């Protein structure tokens, strides 16, 4: 029930006032789950990329966080080859940081924040978290080539 | 004066780097403190060239390796440097504490003992090397006292 009352403000609020570089609409394939587009963070290798995410709303939402993956392939320390996201506000307390004081927008903002600022202390990809840190340009080259084959048009 | 170590670490290992370590010889105190004060990313591809040039199979790499670390432990403590380069430098001391022989790491741990007694430990990021060296001491089960015996006396001296 609560899913409807959150999603109502959220769908409406993501059509009327979504965050900068970000959109979220009720999916045309999937008229239950949400499609987002996060446009590649400025002065990151993701520049000129449009990154599609599926946001799965759980049933007991807003008591559980949203369930988000990068559907556009992304070369990133906190994102693996299947789009899985290392995010605190994607999990519940104490491992995570979701709570009802948040919403789909605040997390999708925190997603464009993580695209620009990969965290090397939560590596899903040790090769990319190491490359990001120790050969920044090779990470930025590979992620920008990534952005040209997969996040381009 | 960094870009004549980046054209050495690109070609081969221990044929032109090992000759640069013995020809410079002047000091690795002014070649790090000032080369980070200009560009911190020039104090992290210099150490990824010096450590590649100075492997622990020879003696004029190990006393270079034992000199670069004592100054690199002193500057992360002494200096009030940026927190993105202390994460970079301590992220090279951790990635290179794996393949040490015995009597150098007990002396580095004695420097650590000296730091814990008196010296102004403004950041506990310098003590991040104290875990991995107590691991790397324990895995060498050979008389350098075996690894575990040196570890127990080391923990006794830390604690007391």
Curated annotation (Swiss-Prot), chain A:
The active site is at 86 (glycyl thioester intermediate). Its EC number is 2.3.2.23. It catalyses: S-ubiquitinyl-[E1 ubiquitin-activating enzyme]-L-cysteine + [E2 ubiquitin-conjugating enzyme]-L-cysteine = [E1 ubiquitin-activating enzyme]-L-cysteine + S-ubiquitinyl-[E2 ubiquitin-conjugating enzyme]-L-cysteine. The keyword tRNA-binding does not apply. Induction: Down-regulated following hypoxia. Up-regulated in breast cancers. One of its GO terms (biological process) is protein K63-linked ubiquitination. One of its GO terms (molecular function) is ubiquitin-protein transferase activity. Changing residue 91 to R: Decreased monoubiquitination. It comes from the Eukaryota. There is a cross-link at residue 91 (Glycyl lysine isopeptide (Lys-Gly) (interchain with G-Cter in ubiquitin)). Pathway: Protein modification; protein ubiquitination. Transmembrane segments: none annotated. Keywords: ATP-binding, Disease variant, DNA damage, DNA repair, Fanconi anemia, Isopeptide bond, Nucleotide-binding, Nucleus, Phosphoprotein, Transferase, Ubl conjugation, Ubl conjugation pathway. Residues 2-152 form the UBC core domain. GO terms for cellular component: nucleolus; nucleoplasm; nucleus. Auto-ubiquitinated. In contrast, according to another report, autoubiquitination does not affect E2 enzyme activity. It is found in: Nucleus. Its main location: nucleus. Directly interacts with FANCL. Interacts with BRCA1. Belongs to the ubiquitin-conjugating enzyme family. It is linked to Fanconi anemia complementation group T: A disorder affecting all bone marrow elements and resulting in anemia, leukopenia and thrombopenia. It is associated with cardiac, renal and limb malformations, dermal pigmentary changes, and a predisposition to the development of malignancies. At the cellular level it is associated with hypersensitivity to DNA-damaging agents, chromosomal instability (increased chromosome breakage) and defective DNA repair. Accepts ubiquitin from the E1 complex and catalyzes its covalent attachment to other proteins. Catalyzes monoubiquitination. Involved in mitomycin-C (MMC)-induced DNA repair. Acts as a specific E2 ubiquitin-conjugating enzyme for the Fanconi anemia complex by associating with E3 ubiquitin-protein ligase FANCL and catalyzing monoubiquitination of FANCD2, a key step in the DNA damage pathway. Also mediates monoubiquitination of FANCL and FANCI. May contribute to ubiquitination and degradation of BRCA1. This is Ubiquitin-conjugating enzyme E2 T. It comes from Homo sapiens (Human). The chain holds residues 1 to 153 of 197 of the full protein.
């Amino acid at each position: 029930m609560q899913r409807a009352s959150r999603l109502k403000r959220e769908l409406h609020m993501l059509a009327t006032e979504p965050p900068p570089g970000i959109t979220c609409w009720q999916d045309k394939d999937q008229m239950d789950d949400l499609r987002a587009q996060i446009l590649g963070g400025a002065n990151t290798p993701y520049e000129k990329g449009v990154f599609k995410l599926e946001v799965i709303i759980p049933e007991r939402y807003p008591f559980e966080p949203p369930q988000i993956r990068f559907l556009t392939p992304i070369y990133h320390p906190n994102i693996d080859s299947a789009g899985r996201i290392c995010l605190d506000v994607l999990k519940l307390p104490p491992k995570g940081a979701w709570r009802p004081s948040l919403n789909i927008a605040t997390v999708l903002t925190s997603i464009q924040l993580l695209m620009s600022e990969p965290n090397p202390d939560d590596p899903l990809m040790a090769d990319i978290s190491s490359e990001f840190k120790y050969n920044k340009p090779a990470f930025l080259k590979n992620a920008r080539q990534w952005t040209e084959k997969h996040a381009r048009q | 004066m960094d870009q004549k170590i980046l054209s050495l670490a690109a070609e081969k290992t221990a044929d032109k780097l090992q000759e640069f370590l013995q020809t410079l010889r002047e000091g690795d105190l002014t070649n790090l403190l000032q080369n980070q004060a200009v560009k911190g990313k020039v104090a992290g591809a210099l150490l990824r060239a010096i450590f590649k040039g100075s492997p622990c199979s020879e003696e004029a790499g190990t006393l270079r390796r034992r000199k670069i670390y004592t100054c690199c432990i002193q500057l992360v403590e002494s200096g009030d440097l940026q927190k993105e380069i202390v994460s970079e430098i301590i992220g090279l001391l951790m990635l290179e504490a794996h393949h040490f022989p015995g009597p150098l790491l007990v002396e580095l741990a004695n420097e650590f003992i000296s730091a814990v007694r008196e010296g102004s430990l403004v950041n506990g990021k310098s003590l991040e090397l104290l875990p991995i060296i107590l691991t790397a001491l324990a895995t060498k089960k050979e008389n350098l006292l075996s690894g575990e015996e040196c570890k127990k006396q080391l923990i006794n001296t830390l604690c007391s």
